Design a protein around this ligand. Structure first.
Ligand SMILES: Nc1ncnc2c1ncn2[C@@H]1O[C@H](COP(=O)(O)OP(=O)(O)OP(=O)(O)O)[C@@H](O)[C@H]1O
Length: 201
């Protein structure tokens, strides 16, 4: 079916902005992470399973999931990242496939996690990995987390090793100047995706 490009990024790399730029070019962007929040709404099955599995600590008083706490758990505990990915993957897949059927752009962009299981995303034509320099990440994390540079630096020391994902990506968008250069690179990628979608079946 539809020519699809998976969008990934390391933390504070700018990938959301990248998605916005593709969107502005008329490209339908599917956000796996938004789907995930949707499908873990109050009293969905996944919501119940997450809470029963992790227990009451991940339930805020207003009954929504403690998504921050669940991230902390999941980034520190790989077995749990996998449990969670495997719980949600079936329902996420289905919601993605629906959106792919009614996709109106020449290709689709699908924002997926940095360490995505290809086997859950076998349908991708390309993988785009966005990355930003350490400095940039640090400046970004500090504005967003309001932490020391040393904490940001600690936050990043924990970041997953990229070298395997780098090798896997078909394109790597190095987000290392300003928004303006970022846009220009997205246009070049866009033109690349149009050309390949045009000539590949
Ligand atoms: N190259 C850049 N120069 C200046 N500002 C930028 C640049 N890239 C992104 N920004 C700004 O950084 C902010 C962070 O947005 P961003 O797209 O980083 O989210 P993100 O990296 O996808 O978040 P996450 O940490 O969940 O991956 C935005 O205000 C954006 O405009």
């Amino acid at each position: 079916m539809v020519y699809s490009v998976g969008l990934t990024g390391n933390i504070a790399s700018g990938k959301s902005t990248v998605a916005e730029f593709f969107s502005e070019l008329g490209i339908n962007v599917i956000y796996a992470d938004k789907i995930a929040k949707e499908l873990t709404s109050k009293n969905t099955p996944c919501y119940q399973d997450i809470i029963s599995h992790f227990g009451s600590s991940v339930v805020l008083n207003n009954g929504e999931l403690d998504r921050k706490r669940i991230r902390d758990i999941i980034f520190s505990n790989s077995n749990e990242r996998l449990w969670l990915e495997s719980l949600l993957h079936p329902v996420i897949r289905k919601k993605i496939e629906e959106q792919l059927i009614v996709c109106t752009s020449p290709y689709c962009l699908i924002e997926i996690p940095l360490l995505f299981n290809k086997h859950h995303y076998p349908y991708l034509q390309k993988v785009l990995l966005v990355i930003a320099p350490l400095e940039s990440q640090l400046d970004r994390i500090v504005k967003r987390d309001h932490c020391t540079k040393k904490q940001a630096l600690a936050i990043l020391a924990t970041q997953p090793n990229l070298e395997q994902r780098l090798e896997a990506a078909d394109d790597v968008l190095i987000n290392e100047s300003g928004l303006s250069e970022l846009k220009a690179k997205v246009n070049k990628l866009h033109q690349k995706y149009l050309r390949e979608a045009k000539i590949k079946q």
